[PDB]
Design a protein around this ligand. Structure first.
Ligand SMILES: CS(=O)(=O)c1ccc(CNC(=O)NC[C@H]2CCOC2)cc1
Length: 330
């Protein structure tokens, strides 16, 4: 089997991407944030505290003839941005782009943090990291990819995120029309539950490539590119008037600037992030200070190849017995 679904930026800055997901019988279609940095499929629901729902589409398990309460199971997750959600668990039929999993754990939110409530466009998350991070207790549950894997033509999914445009998530096949050149594969560590890999280095604009190992995660659920402070300083030093602002919470730059590109290494290959991809617009409406798309990881504890980086590539999440990541230009 295979699946193919379009992923659409939630706003004009590509702050996140939503992909329609069919849940239950008859189908209830929710727009979920596909997150290769977490392992829970959770949704706004008929159980979510009413005051915490503000425009999201909800899953109502009582209206699904295939929904089953997973008795005694609860979940609770806290994300790197400080947001959180928790609730109980159903199993139900979940389809993405034509690919169907029966008995998928659908984590029904009873509580969500303010950032979730405040974002009307995201109806929940679909985690695509390794199932070892799944928060369901007392019986840990499998991701949608882990449940689908054995049925897929090839045990892979691919992320093809658009810059200011829709893109695609494919399951079970590699669309050889979707990228240029060849796919470079690189080793993955699953020891922290993430798609964790080591970049071979970077370049700023037309600058010379610096060969240096940068361990980090491929995380579709994080907007920006978070890298060591040395690398980030080298980038923003090339932008007149750029500075790190403690009050704003990262590097800002004059909105009048033309940003340089950023290149990262994948083995001997190179992925180039155009400068425009690094512009996240005014810090506040009407400001001439713009927020940068490359930020320090120093306060995180891990480097994160988020959407800014991943949207410059066609990315293969290879779930073979030994997982690997693939990157191609496009
Ligand atoms: C409420 S929301 O904006 O829809 C949302 C979606 C997904 C995550 C998962 N990503 C994440 O935690 N990234 C961590 C990085 C960003 C900061 O700290 C480092 C968090 C929040």
């Amino acid at each position: 089997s295979t699946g193919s679904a379009t992923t659409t930026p939630i706003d004009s800055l590509d702050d996140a991407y939503i992909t329609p997901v069919q849940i239950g019988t008859p189908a209830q279609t929710l727009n979920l944030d596909f997150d290769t940095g977490s392992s829970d499929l959770w949704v706004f629901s008929s159980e979510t505290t009413a005051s915490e729902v503000d425009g999201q589409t909800i899953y109502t398990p009582s209206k699904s003839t295939t929904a089953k309460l997973l008795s005694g199971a609860t979940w609770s997750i806290s994300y790197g941005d400080g947001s959180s959600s928790s609730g109980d668990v159903y199993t139900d039929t979940v389809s993405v782009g034509g690919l169907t999993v029966t008995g998928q754990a659908v984590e029904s939110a009873k509580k969500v943090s303010s950032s979730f409530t405040e974002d009307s466009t995201i109806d929940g998350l679909l985690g695509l990291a390794f199932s070892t991070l799944n928060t369901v207790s007392p019986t840990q549950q499998k991701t949608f990819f882990d449940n689908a894997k054995a049925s897929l033509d090839s045990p892979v999914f691919t992320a093809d995120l658009g810059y200011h445009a829709p893109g695609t998530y494919n399951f079970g096949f590699i669309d050889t029309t979707a990228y240029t050149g060849s796919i470079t594969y690189t080793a993955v560590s699953t020891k922290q539950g993430f798609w964790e890999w080591t970049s071979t280095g970077y370049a700023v604009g037309s600058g010379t490539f610096k060969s240096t190992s940068i361990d980090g995660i491929a995380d579709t659920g994080t907007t920006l590119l978070y890298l060591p402070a040395t690398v980030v300083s080298a980038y923003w030093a090339q932008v007149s008037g750029a500075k790190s602002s403690s009050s704003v919470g990262g590097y800002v730059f004059p909105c009048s600037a033309t940003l340089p590109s950023f290149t990262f290494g994948v083995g001997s290959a190179r992925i180039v992030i155009p400068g425009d991809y690094i512009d996240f617009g005014p810090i506040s409406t009407g400001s001439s200070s713009c927020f940068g798309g490359i930020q320090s990881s120093a306060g995180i504890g891990i480097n994160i190849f988020g959407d800014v980086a991943l949207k410059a590539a066609f990315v293969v999440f290879n779930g073979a017995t030994t997982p690997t990541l693939g990157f191609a230009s496009k």
